[PDB]
Amino acid sequence: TFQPIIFSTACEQEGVANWRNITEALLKQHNVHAPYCRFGKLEGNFALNKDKTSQEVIDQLVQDGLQFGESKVTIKVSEGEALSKFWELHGRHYNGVMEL
Numbered sequence: 001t002f003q004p005i006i007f008s009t010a011c012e013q014e015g016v017a018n019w020r021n022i023t024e025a026l027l028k029q030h031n032v033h034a035p036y037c038r039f040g041k042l043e044g045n046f047a048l049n050k051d052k053t054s055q056e057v058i059d060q061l062v063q064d065g066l067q068f069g070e071s072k073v074t075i076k077v078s079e080g081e082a083l084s085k086f087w088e089l090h091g092r093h094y095n096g097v098m099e100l
Helices: 019-030 055-064 081-099
Strands: 005-010 036-039 043-048 066-068 071-078
Touching: 005 081, 019 036, 019 043, 019 055, 019 066, 036 081, 055 071, 071 081
Parallel strands: none
Antiparallel strands: 005 043, 005 071, 036 043, 066 071
8 A cells, every 4th residue: 555756767778777776776876775666678667765755865866866887867756646647557567566
């Protein structure tokens, strides 16, 4: 029943990042723990806990994004209407990852 704050990511090049790498990168670089992470071909998403999400982290995430060598991955904050849309469209994906 948990609905964490959702963030979206996009890469400049394919193969620069993966769901595993992003989770490790996100943790180390921002010192935050993600309950959910999924990556597609060139883009992906991740979540953070409301208790483990701060404004300072959110500003940091968008501004600095995630660094993968010489490639940079941008981060976008999904909230409100965007968050509701994510749950509807990606609800099955979210559940599947959380179950694993």
